[PDB]
Amino acid sequence: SKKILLPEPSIRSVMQKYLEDRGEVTFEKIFSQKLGYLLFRDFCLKHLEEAKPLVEFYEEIKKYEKLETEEERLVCSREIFDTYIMKELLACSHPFSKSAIEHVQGHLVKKQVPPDLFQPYIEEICQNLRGDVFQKFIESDKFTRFCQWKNVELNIHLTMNDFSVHRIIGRGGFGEVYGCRKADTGKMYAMKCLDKKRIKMKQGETLALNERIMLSLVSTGDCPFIVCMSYAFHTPDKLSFILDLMNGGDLHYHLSQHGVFSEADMRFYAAEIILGLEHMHNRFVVYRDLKPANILLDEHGHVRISDLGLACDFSKKKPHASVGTHGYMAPEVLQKGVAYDSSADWFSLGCMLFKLLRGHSPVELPDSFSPELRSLLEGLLQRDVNRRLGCLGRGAQEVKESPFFRSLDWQMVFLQKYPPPLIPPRGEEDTKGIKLLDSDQELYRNFPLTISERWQQEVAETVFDTINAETDRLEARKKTKNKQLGHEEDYALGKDCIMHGYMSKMGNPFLTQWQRRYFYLFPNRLEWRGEGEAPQSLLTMEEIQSVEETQIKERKCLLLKIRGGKQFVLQCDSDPELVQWKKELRDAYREAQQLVQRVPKMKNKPRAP
Amino acid sequence: ASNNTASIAQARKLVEQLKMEANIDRIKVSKAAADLMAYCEAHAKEDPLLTPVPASENPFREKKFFC
Amino acid sequence: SELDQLRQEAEQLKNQIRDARKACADATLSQITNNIDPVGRIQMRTRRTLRGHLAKIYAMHWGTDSRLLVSASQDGKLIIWDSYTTNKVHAIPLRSSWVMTCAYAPSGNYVACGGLDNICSIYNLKTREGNVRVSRELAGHTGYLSCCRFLDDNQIVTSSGDTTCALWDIETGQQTTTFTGHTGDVMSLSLAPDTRLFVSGACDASAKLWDVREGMCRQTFTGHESDINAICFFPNGNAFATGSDDATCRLFDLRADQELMTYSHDNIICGITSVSFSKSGRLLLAGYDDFNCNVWDALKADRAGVLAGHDNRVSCLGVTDDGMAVATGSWDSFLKIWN
RNA sequence: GGCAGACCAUACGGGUUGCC
Ligand SMILES: [Mg+2]
Structure with missing residues (x-):
């Protein structure tokens, strides 16, 4: 088998400096990196003792906001107060300010428990922990262990020998989709392998570069309503994007199985895309391809979005072309020499919502519907921009506070807490007149880079701990044998x-x-x-x-x-x-x-x- | 007015130094020659460079029992 | 016009002080010496091969017990060797790799050194264990540390690159007195055997004598053309000589108060690095740039012989207190011994 | 009118030559 092996402490003195000149070298920009929280806690808990009380404090504040109900929020607020706030003033080692405590004081006898109840403290947890604690962490062997990990981040450059492919699950455009696995660790990702010789043929090099560039800005913070990219690479004859993988199928295929869909059924699903849309709109991206067939589902059944393909940047330069699936287009994109924005998606969404109810596509609405849904889809599918929703100023929030999404809360949808209405079960040689040119291989630089964050998670679930100790297990047996041989204090x-x-x-x-x-x-x-x-x-x-x-x-x-x-x-x-x-x-x-x-x-x- | 009195104290420090060195009574060149010629000739007998001493007495050659 | 009344009263001082010297000077050393027997060609042999330092060597110093020494080198380490056996007694790295001068206490118990750390770093050889550690850190001068020489195991004096020397009390780490006088950067300093007097040179091209205990200059010596690198004292405590980047050496008397003899051959271009007398004193040796010292009949000023062996600049040298042999510090990272 | 091919979409099935 294959398993990646870390570097040595020696790198610290090399690496430390590498970061310092960049600037990603403070309390926040290490902690932020969830590993830089993990090694912090592993340090702060296990070694330092002034930090431990503020960590179990901080950890249990995250386990208050992330709780299911509001009635059970009080049970944990009494578990906290009696100890994590109260106890510290009994030993009188509570350094927290007056107005800090008088917020939690007045409102935990009032009992009202909003998630932003304990927030003025969370900023003071940070406040104190970045003073010395942060510094005195730096001087730790765990802080070292970080560097060891972080080097491997900037060493990671991908091949095809590193991967163990199983099946095939897609053909279209320049290449084919492979359902891959990572042999180093072991988890299912999605390789979108492309055959290089077919891009110079069709001349779809603007869209190929685009589809790469888009994945990155989208795939930043975790969003389980979008199939995020993980890694990207090119080889002398192939190109591949490595992304999340899902079983289910698509909405076009299950519209075939179940048929037409219910009111409470579609409400849940429609709520999934709006946050994906929010994540696209907040970082300035348009999909330009809203479709039930281009939407996937996983083993649980929760949904995401598929073939970016036509997604082009509206960030600064608006494209005035006739781009989109011939059907889900607004009257803005269709016009020649006229600009548009998020409107192109919001219209395509309302167009999709119909298809997830009836089965075809043609304004007028049916008879046996509910009062709130008429006010919704007439707004979504209005010909003008100023009269349509999501194009006035807010964007995604105009959809949120609608009477349709009135019963449901927007924090539980966020965490896949609402259940899926139903469960999915679980049972060539055309181009031989084109060669490897040197003008083609010039523009493949600036392609292969991995996301700092999304990777850090990959390890978090799999094999961080079992490696952590196993390298430590030999860091001892090294220095042990180094001692057996008469020691040397590092020159x-x-x-x-x-x-x-x-x-x-x-x-x-x-x-x-x-x-x-x-x-x-x-x-x-x-x-x-x-x-x-x-x-x-x-x-x-x-x-x-x-x-x-x-x-x-x-x-x-x-x-x-x-x-x-x-x-x-x-x-x-x-x-x-x-x-x-x-x-x-x-x-x-x-x-x-x-x-x-x-x-x-x-x-x-x-x-x- | 800044470097006027700054260079004056230095220039005054100079005349102090000049008068200091001029005070000393001196001796003629013939007096120093003999004193230190005779010193060289008085201690010339006991020089291991001028007198290439025996190999045994010389450590770096062959002096016997050390330690 | 008092600045004018001082400058015109200086030219008259200069010319009148120099007339006091030249009123005394009637005959030279060459006349005095021409009579007596010549030296004969003294041609020594290499003895020892001190493989040790990897980088270039700078200043050295002789262990008072005539078998040991400390040697400073660019490699950021100071070594103590046994000259008899060819064994490195101890190897020590400095806190700052910018080393320049090294010294050795008269007792042979403690040691000092330093350079562009602008500091004289000091250690102890035999503590309450054996492991060698830093004793004290000495700061004061703004510029570098040129050279340093002991009084005993409780006081010491240095020379620096802010154009001043200074006396130090080991106990406290405070300047007993201060020696302002040089305009150029101070380089080499030489002790009196009696340890109540001292001389030193500078880049201005002048030599100055100093009363140790008081804290002021006694005499000015002018003559040298270029920077004054080297310096050493004559045994009797009333004579000394120097070397320079002019490519000549000169000799000076104190009571007489002037230059005595010039050591200038016409097939000599390069400068001196540190000079030294013999036990008898008749022999003078200059740390030349051409990878070997030349001996000089300090009396007649004739070249006796040369110590060819180094393959790079000779940075310093020294004689054993008992005049037995000669060390040679050089940039080729080697130290050889001659007798 | 139906099927078949071409053009495109393809982790999807909807938008001109030949044959009844
Ligand atoms: Mg595509």
């Missing part, structure tokens, strides 16, 4: 060292002989060690001229321009490593050589022709 301990790590030099620019060694950067030198010894090989910063990068048999590598009419070889394991050397590497020598001129003893002898 760059108390000095003015900046950073250190791993790299591969070729012993001499001539042979084909790669030796990998460990390196230590200094203000005035560079040393490096092998397996056992303490440094016996060396290079000053005086000795260097400049430092460039270069391609080596299609591998980006480091040149070390030598003062004495020669050069030197380098190579890294991961991608980012390379970088942070270069940055403070390029600076260290220049600032080293800068102050060489100012000193009389240390200087190079003055030139004299």
Whole structure:
């Protein structure tokens, strides 16, 4: 089998710096990253003891808002108060402010329990925890463990050998849909594999690039009403988007099985898409393809959206084309030389709602309907923009407060709490006159990138813990064996060292002989060690001229321009490593050589022709 | 008015220094020659560079029992 | 016009103080010395091969017990070696890799060093264990640390790159007195054996004597063309000599108060790094740039011989207190011994 | 009028040549 293996602590000193120069290096921008919460809790709970009470506090506040009913919200509000707020003032180690406590005080004797009852405290939980606690976390071996994980994030570059495909489940356009699995861990995703040679044929390169670009902005925060993209990659003969996978089918197929649908049935389902639409409208995207056939369902039965295809950006540049499924179009998109916005979706939605009731499509409405639904669909499907809903100012909220969605609350729909009305069961050679061109492979850069967040989750459910310990299990048996062999306190301990790590030099620019060694950067030198010894090989910063990068048999590598009419070889394991050397590497020598001129003893002898 | 009195204190510090060095009584060149010539010739006998001492007495060559 | 009344009263001082010197000077050393026996060619042999430092070596210092030494190098470490056996007694890394000078206490118990940390870092060799640790951190000067020399195991004096020296009390870590006087950056300083007097050089091209206990300059010495790198003292406590980037050496007397002899051969272009006398004093050695020192009949000023062996700049040197042999610190990362 | 093909949609079935 295959399982991904972490790097070592050495990366910390390399990585730490990598982030600091970006800025994603504070209380928020680590915590935010749910792992950076997980390792925080793993730290804050298990090691620090002033933090533990604020964590079980914070964790149990999330388990108050996320509760089912309002009558059971009080039972947990009494479990909390008596302890997590009360107890801390009995030991008198409650640092929280007056107006903070007098909000929860007055309203937990009044008893009214809105979810934004304990919110003025949540910001003070944050407030205190970013002071020292945050800092003193940094100085932890868990904070290290993070870096180890985070490197693997920026090392991840995908292949086809990494995947274990089972079946096939789609054909259309440029490629075919494969139902894939991740062999490293083990979970079902959706590969949308494309055959490269058919894109230059049809010239659908604007739409192919578009369909990639859109997935990203959509697939940011988790939204179970949209099939989010996870990873993207290209190979010399194939292209693939890796996304969520679902069993069910589509609304066109189940309209065949069940037939026409009920009032309370469609209400639930229609509520699913509006939040997907909200997630599209809030980050400025239009699907331009609202259809029952283009909507999927999972093992539970909850719904999502499928073939983006025609989704183009309205962010800044509005497209005035005649785009859409010939049927679910508003009177704005159809016109030639006229702009439109979310209207193109809202109209297509109302068009879809009819089909999820009757079965065909033609304004007038039927007889045996309810009073609220007439006021709804007449608004959705109005010819003008100013008179139609969702195009006045709010957007998705004009749909929310409608009398149809009056009984239902908009926080329970949010969490898939309402049940699905019914359950789903569970029982070539055309193009051989086109080749691999070099003008085609120029525009495939800027394609393969993974979402920082969506991946972090992938691990959260699967095998984070069982790896966490298993690497720790060998981090002991390493240092244990390191001790057996007589210890060494990591060379760059108390000095003015900046950073250190791993790299591969070729012993001499001539042979084909790669030796990998460990390196230590200094203000005035560079040393490096092998397996056992303490440094016996060396290079000053005086000795260097400049430092460039270069391609080596299609591998980006480091040149070390030598003062004495020669050069030197380098190579890294991961991608980012390379970088942070270069940055403070390029600076260290220049600032080293800068102050060489100012000193009389240390200087190079003055030139004299 | 700033660097006027700043360079004056320095210029006054100079005349203080100049008068300090001028005070000392001096000795003629012949007096120093003999004192330190004779010193060189007085301690010239006991120099291991001038007198290439025996190999055994010399540690870095071959002095025997150490430690 | 008082600034004018000081400057015109300085040219008259300069010319009259120099007339007091030249009224004394009638004969030279060459006349005095021409009579006596010549040195003969002293051609030493390499003895020891101190493989150790990896980066370039800078200042060294001699262990008072004539078998040990501390040597400073760019590699951010200071080593203590046994000269007899070729064994590195202890290896120590500095807190700041910007090292310049190293020293050795008279007792041979504690040690000091430093550089562009702008600090004199100090350690102890035998604590209440054996593991070597930092004793104290010394700050004060704005610029770098050029050179440093002990009094005993309770006081010390340094020279810095803010154009001033300073005396220090080990107990406290405070300046006993201060020695403002040089306009150029101070470089090398030399102790009196009696330890109540000292001399030092600077980039302005002047040498100045200093009363140790009081805290002021006693004499000014002018002559050198370029920067004054090296310096050393004559055994009797009333004579000293220096080297420079001009590519010459000069000798000076104190009571007499002037230059005595110039050591300038016409096939010499490169500068000196640190100079030193013999036990007898007749022999002077300059840390040349051409990877070897030259001996000088300090009396007649004739070149005795050369120590070819290094393959890179000679940064410093020193004699054993008993005049037995000679060390040589060099940029080729080696230390060899000659007798 | 029906079927078959072409053009397109395809994790979907709806919008011109030949044959009765
Ligand atoms: Mg498509």
